[PDB]
Every structure is written in C-alpha cells, then in structure tokens.
Design a protein around this motif. Structure first.
Motif, PDB file in Angstrom:
ATOM      1  N   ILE A   1       0.825  -1.193   0.000  1.00  0.00           N
ATOM      2  CA  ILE A   1       0.000   0.000   0.000  1.00  0.00           C
ATOM      3  C   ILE A   1       0.865   1.251   0.000  1.00  0.00           C
ATOM      4  N   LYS A   2       0.425   2.222  -0.788  1.00  0.00           N
ATOM      5  CA  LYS A   2       1.117   3.485  -0.896  1.00  0.00           C
ATOM      6  C   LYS A   2       0.125   4.573  -0.523  1.00  0.00           C
ATOM      7  N   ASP A   3       0.563   5.403   0.396  1.00  0.00           N
ATOM      8  CA  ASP A   3      -0.234   6.503   0.861  1.00  0.00           C
ATOM      9  C   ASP A   3      -1.741   6.287   0.798  1.00  0.00           C
ATOM     10  N   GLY A   4      -2.209   5.322   1.576  1.00  0.00           N
ATOM     11  CA  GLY A   4      -3.630   5.058   1.651  1.00  0.00           C
ATOM     12  C   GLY A   4      -4.187   4.063   0.665  1.00  0.00           C
ATOM     13  N   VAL A   5      -3.776   4.137  -0.597  1.00  0.00           N
ATOM     14  CA  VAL A   5      -4.311   3.199  -1.565  1.00  0.00           C
ATOM     15  C   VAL A   5      -3.371   2.070  -1.888  1.00  0.00           C
ATOM     16  N   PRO A   6      -3.947   0.904  -2.245  1.00  0.00           N
ATOM     17  CA  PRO A   6      -3.260  -0.339  -2.608  1.00  0.00           C
ATOM     18  C   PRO A   6      -2.472  -0.200  -3.894  1.00  0.00           C
ATOM     19  N   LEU A   7      -1.260  -0.728  -3.873  1.00  0.00           N
ATOM     20  CA  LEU A   7      -0.376  -0.646  -5.012  1.00  0.00           C
ATOM     21  C   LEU A   7      -1.047  -1.033  -6.309  1.00  0.00           C
ATOM     22  N   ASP A   8      -1.545  -2.253  -6.380  1.00  0.00           N
ATOM     23  CA  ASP A   8      -2.199  -2.707  -7.592  1.00  0.00           C
ATOM     24  C   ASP A   8      -3.182  -1.688  -8.176  1.00  0.00           C
ATOM     25  N   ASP A   9      -3.885  -0.954  -7.320  1.00  0.00           N
ATOM     26  CA  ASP A   9      -4.840   0.034  -7.802  1.00  0.00           C
ATOM     27  C   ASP A   9      -4.207   1.216  -8.536  1.00  0.00           C
ATOM     28  N   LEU A  10      -2.893   1.346  -8.470  1.00  0.00           N
ATOM     29  CA  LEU A  10      -2.245   2.425  -9.190  1.00  0.00           C
ATOM     30  C   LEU A  10      -1.759   1.781 -10.461  1.00  0.00           C
ATOM     31  N   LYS A  11      -1.064   0.663 -10.317  1.00  0.00           N
ATOM     32  CA  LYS A  11      -0.567  -0.042 -11.486  1.00  0.00           C
ATOM     33  C   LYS A  11      -1.740  -0.053 -12.475  1.00  0.00           C
ATOM     34  N   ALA A  12      -2.954  -0.127 -11.939  1.00  0.00           N
ATOM     35  CA  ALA A  12      -4.161  -0.147 -12.755  1.00  0.00           C
ATOM     36  C   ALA A  12      -4.214   1.010 -13.732  1.00  0.00           C
ATOM     37  N   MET A  13      -3.881   2.193 -13.230  1.00  0.00           N
ATOM     38  CA  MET A  13      -3.925   3.426 -14.010  1.00  0.00           C
ATOM     39  C   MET A  13      -2.603   3.781 -14.644  1.00  0.00           C
TER      40      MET A  13
ATOM     41  N   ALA B   1       6.230   0.663 -18.175  1.00  0.00           N
ATOM     42  CA  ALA B   1       6.801  -0.535 -17.576  1.00  0.00           C
ATOM     43  C   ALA B   1       6.262  -1.088 -16.249  1.00  0.00           C
ATOM     44  N   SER B   2       5.562  -2.211 -16.343  1.00  0.00           N
ATOM     45  CA  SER B   2       5.018  -2.862 -15.160  1.00  0.00           C
ATOM     46  C   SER B   2       6.156  -3.595 -14.474  1.00  0.00           C
ATOM     47  N   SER B   3       7.081  -4.101 -15.281  1.00  0.00           N
ATOM     48  CA  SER B   3       8.232  -4.828 -14.763  1.00  0.00           C
ATOM     49  C   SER B   3       9.011  -3.985 -13.759  1.00  0.00           C
ATOM     50  N   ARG B   4       8.679  -2.702 -13.675  1.00  0.00           N
ATOM     51  CA  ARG B   4       9.387  -1.815 -12.772  1.00  0.00           C
ATOM     52  C   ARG B   4       9.020  -2.157 -11.354  1.00  0.00           C
TER      53      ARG B   4
ATOM     54  N   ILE C   1      11.913  -1.547  -6.728  1.00  0.00           N
ATOM     55  CA  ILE C   1      11.606  -0.368  -7.515  1.00  0.00           C
ATOM     56  C   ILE C   1      12.814   0.157  -8.275  1.00  0.00           C
ATOM     57  N   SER C   2      12.986  -0.342  -9.499  1.00  0.00           N
ATOM     58  CA  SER C   2      14.084   0.067 -10.376  1.00  0.00           C
ATOM     59  C   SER C   2      13.706   1.344 -11.138  1.00  0.00           C
ATOM     60  N   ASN C   3      14.662   2.259 -11.283  1.00  0.00           N
ATOM     61  CA  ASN C   3      14.423   3.526 -11.964  1.00  0.00           C
ATOM     62  C   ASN C   3      13.368   4.318 -11.211  1.00  0.00           C
ATOM     63  N   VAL C   4      13.771   4.878 -10.076  1.00  0.00           N
ATOM     64  CA  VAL C   4      12.871   5.661  -9.240  1.00  0.00           C
ATOM     65  C   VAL C   4      12.531   7.008  -9.861  1.00  0.00           C
ATOM     66  N   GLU C   5      11.333   7.492  -9.554  1.00  0.00           N
ATOM     67  CA  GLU C   5      10.850   8.766 -10.071  1.00  0.00           C
ATOM     68  C   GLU C   5      10.157   9.519  -8.944  1.00  0.00           C
ATOM     69  N   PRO C   6      10.176  10.862  -8.998  1.00  0.00           N
ATOM     70  CA  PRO C   6       9.555  11.733  -7.987  1.00  0.00           C
ATOM     71  C   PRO C   6       8.115  11.339  -7.672  1.00  0.00           C
ATOM     72  N   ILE C   7       7.650  10.331  -8.393  1.00  0.00           N
ATOM     73  CA  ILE C   7       6.312   9.813  -8.232  1.00  0.00           C
ATOM     74  C   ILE C   7       6.393   8.558  -7.336  1.00  0.00           C
ATOM     75  N   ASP C   8       7.520   7.843  -7.419  1.00  0.00           N
ATOM     76  CA  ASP C   8       7.779   6.633  -6.626  1.00  0.00           C
ATOM     77  C   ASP C   8       8.050   6.971  -5.170  1.00  0.00           C
ATOM     78  N   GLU C   9       7.879   8.234  -4.831  1.00  0.00           N
ATOM     79  CA  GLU C   9       8.126   8.663  -3.481  1.00  0.00           C
ATOM     80  C   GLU C   9       6.819   8.632  -2.702  1.00  0.00           C
TER      81      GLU C   9
END
Length: 202
Positions: free
Chosen positions: A140-152, A156-159, A170-178
């Motif tokens: 889970i990331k900040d309240g919501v379940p991971l899979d529910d973001l991967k959804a949108m 690269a899902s392999s990330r 988490i390969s190739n981090v982004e200001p969003i992966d925070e």
C-alpha cells in the motif's frame, strides 16, 4: 426384537476453524444394545474425557474441542472418524477433515524508511508472518493499494514489482515513486499490517 448392529445416522463433516476456536465433529449412531463410540485421528485413536487431553466426547458421540490447538505442543488439524461397536457388530464413519487456520502476528522483516537516488533501484522490505492457509501479501502506498495504481499506470510494469515473497522492488525511481509504503499479509484468520515507511526520492 433385540440386537441391531451399529448404524451411523450422521457422519462427521469436514470443518475449518481458527486456532483457539471451539470445534465439533458429529457422530450420531444407533444400535441395540446401545453401541459405544471411539474416535480416531489419522489412524490413531483419540483419547477423550481424560485429565490429560483437551478433547471431550459428548454422550451423543460428538467429539468436542473447547479450545482448538495447532502449535508445537498439540496439533488438532487432521483426518477424523468414529467407530460404533456393540455386540452385534460395528460401523465406521466416513472420514472428515479438521483444519485449523492460523496467522502469527510477527513479520519476518518489516520495511524501514529509505531515501533513494533518482533513476536508481530501491528495495522495500517485507517478510510476511507465517500462516496457514498461506497468507497473501499486498503493498500500500499513501492510503491506496499498489495494484490500484498499477491499474492506471502506463509504462513498464516490470518496474515496481514484488519479489522474494514480500520485498518490493523499484528500479528507476521517479519523484512519483516517493511516498509511504506498507505491506499487508492476509488469510482466513485476519490481516497483518507492517508499519509504514517513507521512501524519499532524489
């Protein structure tokens, strides 16, 4: 007249309960003279109504556990059946299986705050606590379940991917992966939540 070989009216039916819950296995029978019932678990006989066991045998033939056990000392989960005997023969009940669900509350590893270098790989840590049925892990990331973001998410899902039965990669981090990450183990018993962890980017 008199005499009537042992007959099994109701066999024990399979059952699923959580460690430390009560459990009952039925064995209604009839026979003239009134037969006596005996219980077996995986080929061996079950001792009931003694100062030593935590198993009780009702006058109706039912095997009763007031506090089911499934640890190092006692293991109640198994295959069960009864056998009614009187002087004009005997009868065996179809087998029934009793299973005890469990879910320890002590992760093997829990994720700890991690600061990472952009574009570079990050590994959050999660070792779900043992349990049976085998529990399932989700992040889970900040309240919501991971899979529910991967959804949108496009790209690269392999990330961002789970691995080693728990650890989030988490390969190739982004200001969003925070953000804040937490893992949750779950099975029939209940759920287990690791503490949260802040992954800061850059």
């Amino acid at each position: 007249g008199q005499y009537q070989s042992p007959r099994i009216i109701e066999h024990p039916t399979d059952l699923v309960v959580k460690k430390n819950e009560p459990a009952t296995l039925n064995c209604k029978v009839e026979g003239k003279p009134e037969p006596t019932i005996e219980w077996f678990k995986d080929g061996e006989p079950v001792s009931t109504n003694e100062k030593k066991s935590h198993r009780v045998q009702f006058k109706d033939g039912a095997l009763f556990f007031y506090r089911t056990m499934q640890g190092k000392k006692e293991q109640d989960g198994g295959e069960y059946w009864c056998v009614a005997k009187n002087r004009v023969g005997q009868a065996v009940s179809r087998h029934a299986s009793l299973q005890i669900a469990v879910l320890r509350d002590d992760f093997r590893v829990e994720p700890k705050d991690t600061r990472v270098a952009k574009g570079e790989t990050a590994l959050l840590e999660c070792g779900p606590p043992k349990g049976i049925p085998e529990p399932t892990l989700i992040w889970i990331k900040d309240g919501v379940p991971l899979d529910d973001l991967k959804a949108m998410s496009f790209g690269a899902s392999s990330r961002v991917r789970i691995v080693d039965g728990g650890n989030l990669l988490i390969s190739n981090v982004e200001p969003i992966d925070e953000g804040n990450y937490k893992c949750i183990a779950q099975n029939l018993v209940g759920t287990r939540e690791s503490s949260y962890a802040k992954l800061i980017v850059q």
